[PDB]
Design a protein around this ligand. Structure first.
Ligand SMILES: O=C1Nc2ccccc2C2(CCN(CCc3ccc(C(F)(F)F)cc3)CC2)O1
Ligand SMILES: O=C1Nc2ccccc2C2(CCN(CCc3ccc(C(F)(F)F)cc3)CC2)O1
Lengths: 306, 306
């Protein structure tokens, strides 16, 4: 019945997006209860961004210098502080649309939805993964800083990403909602290069399970393998090593399809060695690695949210 | 700065989804002002679906047989009628969350977002195209019927699709919001096969323009072509014929990049003849055809919505 790259419904997050302006710089903020969270580089000029001293730049800013606008209506800033690379602006009004929420710091390989915004207004929603090199491959133009990534479990939004930086290579870097960057990146306009973008092996396997459930099975073979034997081939192809924890997480997909995890590893190994020979799997000519095992279960089951 | 398959923010549509139950069948409805729109096959049993006489089945249904539930709260049905393949259930309460909206019947090649729902509750959002054979390639399980497709232009939601049927081949068929199917499909469980799924040429070209804007340009060559010469190769590869209307629509992308439309056609022609040779374009090993020229402009510019 079909399998699609699918984002969470975005309404709960749309009701949290505001515009934040400091000086000549405008980007997005996240309004939850009576706090607005945004990237601290809102206080920088494009001059400042080469070597900013954020503590010093903040000395010159008062509450009234942070212009916060929710739709057409202005919010009153009654306090501000810096936590790592985010500012927290206390406003005098609790966001009436605040959903149940959590702040979560995700691990490489985990997926989330991004609500890309400009000037506090939603532009679109798409699905991303935290890459093993701690970048994400997004769609972000100037003014999109402060857009957030999130997951939803029924009624509760877990915010995991806030967007801050584009690297010279066109990939993206950002923080969790406590303001700590994922990976080694900093909020300065300098030479920072991403490391190897390896493939998230457990996600590829989950997606192969999804393909089998949906009728694409030409890649199933007569072979099996072992974790160590498969991992020799994964390393050669810049795939993440597969662990027993990963095998365990694939357990429910293995059980429903009747295909042992290591048998699916042997299918993956032949795909890596032989290529696709011009065929497709679930409409892709590449092996997709931005579906987690939990994503596959969810979509193949029809789980929903408030 | 990156280019992603991107859906519209879904909040405005989330506030319109309800659950509709008739007998033992539950699916989704769309609540706009004081009318709930849903597939007429809600009145069928799985028996009925082999050869339904919808007019006859409706004789046995009264207002009180249609159970409409918005979140936890029941809506009072004060009238019902059948329009083509949709039912319209008049309720006694206008949806307080009704956005500005229109009903639009789209053309093959046009794209839209789908809010997949189960039991009136949103599950996820993804982007789709109306295929040239009038199917869509979605992600729909039992109970997702009545999920809708839509586009947004600033504050106004244009609803273009309601989901009704999965064909035996795993592709999807549905109606506009006046209840007329796209293509030749009917709401009966019978032998209906899709025609040729051809590639939407103008969308592929738009996506190649997007790639150039974002740094992927290895596929640009030293050649040009003509509409007629390109169309001979398109036919061979089951690509839609390119028209002068299509060339005109690509005009703004041509102007911004400085690459004449027919020059990009010559790049596409070499890609079709030679394949990708194992390379990728914007993270795909296939030529993507579910971005319209307007989608590319929008995403490459940062246009937003209420
Ligand atoms: O729409 C429909 N009609 C339908 C019609 C005929 C056969 C099967 C179906 C199903 C019914 C639920 N069936 C869920 C089975 C399942 C799959 C994966 C997992 C898991 F591994 F992810 F956990 C668990 C259960 C999916 C297909 O759906
Ligand atoms: O974020 C940023 N910083 C930035 C930094 C350096 C160079 C360019 C930029 C741009 C500035 C706007 N620029 C829009 C140009 C444009 C592209 C396509 C079209 C169209 F063909 F679709 F119509 C029209 C205009 C995109 C990149 O963006």
């Amino acid at each position: 019945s079909g399998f699609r790259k699918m984002a969470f419904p975005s309404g709960k997050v749309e009701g949290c997006m505001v515009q934040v302006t400091c000086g000549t710089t405008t980007l997005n903020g996240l309004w939850l209860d009576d706090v607005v969270y945004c990237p601290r580089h809102v206080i920088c000029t494009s001059e400042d961004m080469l070597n900013p001293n954020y503590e010093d730049l903040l000395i010159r800013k008062s509450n009234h210098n942070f212009l916060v606008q929710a739709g057409n209506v202005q919010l009153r800033v009654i306090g501000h502080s810096m936590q790592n690379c985010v500012l927290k602006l206390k406003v005098d009004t609790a966001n009436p649309k605040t959903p149940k929420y959590k702040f979560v710091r995700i691990q490489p390989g985990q997926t989330f939805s991004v609500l890309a915004c400009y000037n506090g207004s939603p532009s679109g929603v798409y699905q991303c993964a935290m890459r093993p090199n701690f970048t994400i491959k997004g769609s972000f133009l100037n003014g999109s800083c402060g857009s957030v990534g999130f997951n939803i479990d029924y009624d509760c939004v877990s915010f995991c990403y806030m967007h801050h930086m584009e690297l010279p290579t066109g990939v993206h870097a950002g923080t969790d909602l406590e303001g700590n960057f994922y990976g080694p990146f900093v909020d300065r306009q300098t030479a920072q290069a991403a490391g190897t973008d390896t493939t998230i092996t457990v996600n590829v396997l989950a997606w192969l399970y999804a393909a089998v459930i949906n009728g694409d099975r030409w890649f199933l073979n007569r072979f099996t393998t072992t974790l160590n034997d498969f991992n020799l081939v994964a390393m050669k192809y810049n795939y993440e090593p597969l662990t027993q924890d990963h095998v365990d997480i694939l357990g429910p997909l293995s059980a429903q399809t009747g295909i042992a995890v290591l048998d699916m590893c042997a299918s993956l190994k032949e795909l890596l060695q032989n290529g696709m020979n011009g065929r497709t799997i679930l409409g892709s000519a590449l092996l997709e690695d931005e579906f987690t095992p939990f994503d596959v279960v969810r979509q193949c089951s029809g789980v929903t949210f408030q």
